[PDB]
Amino acid sequence: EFRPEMLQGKKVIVTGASKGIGREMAYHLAKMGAHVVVTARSKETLQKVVSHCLELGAASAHYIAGTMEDMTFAEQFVAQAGKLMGGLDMLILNHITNTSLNLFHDDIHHVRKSMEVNFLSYVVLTVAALPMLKQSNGSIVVVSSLAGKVAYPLVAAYSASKFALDGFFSSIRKEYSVSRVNVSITLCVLGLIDTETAMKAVSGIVHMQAAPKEECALEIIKGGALRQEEVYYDSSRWTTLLIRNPSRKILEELYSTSYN
Amino acid sequence: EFRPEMLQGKKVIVTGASKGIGREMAYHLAKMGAHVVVTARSKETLQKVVSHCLELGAASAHYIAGTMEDMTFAEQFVAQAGKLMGGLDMLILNHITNTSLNLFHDDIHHVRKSMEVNFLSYVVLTVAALPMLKQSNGSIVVVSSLAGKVAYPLVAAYSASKFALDGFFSSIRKEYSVSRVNVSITLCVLGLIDTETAMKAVSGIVHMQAAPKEECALEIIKGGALRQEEVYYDSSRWTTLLIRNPSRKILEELYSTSYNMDRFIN
Ligand SMILES: NC(=O)c1ccc[n+]([C@@H]2O[C@H](COP(=O)([O-])OP(=O)(O)OC[C@H]3O[C@@H](n4cnc5c(N)ncnc54)[C@H](OP(=O)(O)O)[C@@H]3O)[C@@H](O)[C@H]2O)c1
Ligand SMILES: NC(=O)c1ccc[n+]([C@@H]2O[C@H](COP(=O)([O-])OP(=O)(O)OC[C@H]3O[C@@H](n4cnc5c(N)ncnc54)[C@H](OP(=O)(O)O)[C@@H]3O)[C@@H](O)[C@H]2O)c1
Numbered sequence: 001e002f003r004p005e006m007l008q009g010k011k012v013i014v015t016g017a018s019k020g021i022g023r024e025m026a027y028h029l030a031k032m033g034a035h036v037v038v039t040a041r042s043k044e045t046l047q048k049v050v051s052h053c054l055e056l057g058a059a060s061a062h063y064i065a066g067t068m069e070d071m072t073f074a075e076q077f078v079a080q081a082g083k084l085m086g087g088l089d090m091l092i093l094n095h096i097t098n099t100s101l102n103l104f105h106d107d108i109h110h111v112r113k114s115m116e117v118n119f120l121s122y123v124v125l126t127v128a129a130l131p132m133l134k135q136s137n138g139s140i141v142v143v144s145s146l147a148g149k150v151a152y153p154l155v156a157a158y159s160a161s162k163f164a165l166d167g168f169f170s171s172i173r174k175e176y177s178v179s180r181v182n183v184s185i186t187l188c189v190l191g192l193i194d195t196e197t198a199m200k201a202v203s204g205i206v207h208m209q210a211a212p213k214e215e216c217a218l219e220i221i222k223g224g225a226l227r228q229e230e231v232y233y234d235s236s237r238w239t240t241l242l243i244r245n246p247s248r249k250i251l252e253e254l255y256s257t258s259y260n
Numbered sequence: 261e262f263r264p265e266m267l268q269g270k271k272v273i274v275t276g277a278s279k280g281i282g283r284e285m286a287y288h289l290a291k292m293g294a295h296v297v298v299t300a301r302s303k304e305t306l307q308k309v310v311s312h313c314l315e316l317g318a319a320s321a322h323y324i325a326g327t328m329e330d331m332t333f334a335e336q337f338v339a340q341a342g343k344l345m346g347g348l349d350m351l352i353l354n355h356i357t358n359t360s361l362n363l364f365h366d367d368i369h370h371v372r373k374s375m376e377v378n379f380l381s382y383v384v385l386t387v388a389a390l391p392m393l394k395q396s397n398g399s400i401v402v403v404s405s406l407a408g409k410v411a412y413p414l415v416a417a418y419s420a421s422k423f424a425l426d427g428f429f430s431s432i433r434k435e436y437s438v439s440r441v442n443v444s445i446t447l448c449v450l451g452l453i454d455t456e457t458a459m460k461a462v463s464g465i466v467h468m469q470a471a472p473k474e475e476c477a478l479e480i481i482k483g484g485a486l487r488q489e490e491v492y493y494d495s496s497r498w499t500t501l502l503i504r505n506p507s508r509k510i511l512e513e514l515y516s517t518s519y520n521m522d523r524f525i526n
């Protein structure tokens with residue numbers, strides 16, 4: 001049902017797109033002939049990503065370098081991005097703060113930074129993006145994890161931020177169905193993905209197989225373009241089957257009649 | 261399995277205990293002859309809770325007033341509460357920032373304030389309380405909501421803060437089975453509760469049967485004493501069935517052996 005032309009000429013933002021899945025999303029969007037604006041802290045890496053996007057066929061490709069620790073950089077990034085492109089059809093929220101597999105001890109700092117970067121910024125970006133996405137009946141694409149659905153050791157602050165994305169964006173989505181705002185929200189529930197960052201963090205600790213990042217990137221884009229509520233992507237067919245939650249869906253619907 | 265004598269002489273903190281579910285939890289604990297230390301911003305209301313705690317039979321009851329927007333207050337509160345009781349057996353995390361029902365718009369202040377008070381303060385309190393809780397092989401009781409498990413409109417920021425509690429404390433729960441820290445974590449998933457705050461917030465916006473705050477409070481204490489992983493409290497016998505997530509537990513156990521804990525356990 002997905003066709004690459006659905007993204008042609010679309011105005012797309014991708015965060016954390018200097019490397020990993022983000023960069024791969026930018027490359028697929030370029031190939032589909034979208035307009036892209038990518039962001040990360042490293043302007044020099046973003047310059048390379050952008051040049052390759054243009055090689056690949058992007059309608060246009062630009063970059064804004066900065067940290068999503070800074071909420072005012074964040075808020076202003078969306079405005080500057082929309083002015084470059086002359087609007088906004090898709091906002092792909094993918095960036096995270098640097099993290100390792102380690103037991104939580106006494107690390108409020110890391111918890112607080114994970115919440116600011118992986119969560120608050122995403123809300124800030126959404127608030128700034130919303131007027132344009134309302135004008136275009138656009139998409140919000142929230143990149144989460146299986147650790148944002150299920151509990152795993154070694155990723156406590158990370159998991160809090162990802163669970164928070166589910167709670168916020170899923171609730172916003174219900175609100176859109178009651179005020180008929182035509183902005184889709186796609187939560188992307190990802191298993192281990194073979195990015196450089198992940199593969200280095202995981203070596204000698206985890207023995208799960210990673211899924212290829214290029215296909216991951218593509219499945220996220222497909223899901224957003226088709227406006228799916230959630231996208232599941234893992235190297236195991238089993239976990240994919242087990243990730244669904246019909247109980248949650250019934251329960252949510254059981255209370256649809258409760259609001260005047 | 262539960263006996264009220266399980267709480268007799270136990271050293272228990274209850275936050276957000278000037279009214280509602282927190283207050284009823286304090287009263288229950290008192291009847292059971294526990295030691296309580298209650299907290300909230302309002303010293304006036306707290307003092308009344310404490311008096312009545314003593315009348316009901318607490319081994320001892322004290323209060324400390326302050327705001328959980330203040331992380332140094334949160335941290336210092338736990339130390340002081342411990343001094344008062346001569347230890348800590350149970351940390352009951354119940355407070356939130358005042359919230360009303362509203363569609364989201366632009367309220368980043370409210371989103372931040374919800375994450376700070378409803379979630380981060382809970383992490384700061386846990387960090388302060390862990391040394392006492394490790395020594396007593398104690399319990400952490402996290403008050404959450406059905407909005408912390410499932411999506412409803414009009415509570416985006418609240419829901420975000422409650423969802424964060426699950427991911428954080430459930431992830432730490434897994435960590436305690438690797439480090440073998442004997443601290444239980446009970447996440448209490450509550451439906452609409454007839455507290456004064458909620459009954460006000462809900463009138464003319466939502467039509468849901470509320471459950472009684474007193475029996476809700478007892479159920480949180482039962483669950484915590486019995487060191488249960490989750491407590492479910494709602495007026496519907498349906499929602500209590502639909503709120504369990506067995507495929508989540510399957511996925512958790514299936515991946516629990518995929519780690520090499522050697523470096524973390526040596
Ligand atoms: N890889 C996996 O196994 C896996 C599994 C499940 C879910 N996911 C999810 O997939 C998404 C991307 O993961 P990834 O593995 O592809 O990551 P990655 O390769 O480590 O890239 C992280 C991106 O975020 C940027 N970034 C880091 N800190 C930032 C900050 N403070 N402000 C702005 N940007 C910042 C990085 O660039 P700069 O350093 O230059 O800023 C980079 O472009 C994340 O949301 C993650 O939760 C990944
Ligand atoms: N009522 C429901 O329907 C319902 C449903 C599901 C879950 N819950 C959960 O149950 C728990 C208790 O709810 P409730 O309805 O019983 O609440 P409540 O009666 O309104 O009481 C809130 C408590 O928190 C205190 N508080 C507010 N702001 C504070 C701050 N910044 N620092 C410290 N304390 C603060 C209040 O006292 P001060 O203002 O004097 O500080 C009061 O003691 C919450 O975690 C809530 O999310 C409630």
Ligand SMILES: O=C(N[C@@H]1[C@@H]2C[C@@H]3C[C@H]1C[C@@](O)(C3)C2)c1sc(OCCO)nc1C1CC1
Pocket residue numbers: 098099100101145146147152155158190191192197198201202206208209234235239
């Ligand atoms: O988000 C994760 N991992 C991320 C990945 C690896 C670690 C933790 C975080 C954030 C990183 O930056 C570093 C990239 C995930 S997703 C997952 O599911 C396994 C089934 O495929 N497990 C994990 C953690 C390995 C348990």
Ligand SMILES: O=C(N[C@@H]1[C@@H]2C[C@@H]3C[C@H]1C[C@@](O)(C3)C2)c1sc(OCCO)nc1C1CC1
Pocket residue numbers: 255358359360361405406407412413415418450451452453457458459461462466468469494495
């Ligand atoms: O936490 C809530 N409510 C809280 C309660 C009343 C409102 C919203 C929040 C926070 C309050 O302080 C204010 C107290 C809940 S729990 C629930 O489950 C449905 C079955 O009972 N629904 C809601 C909200 C009505 C959607």
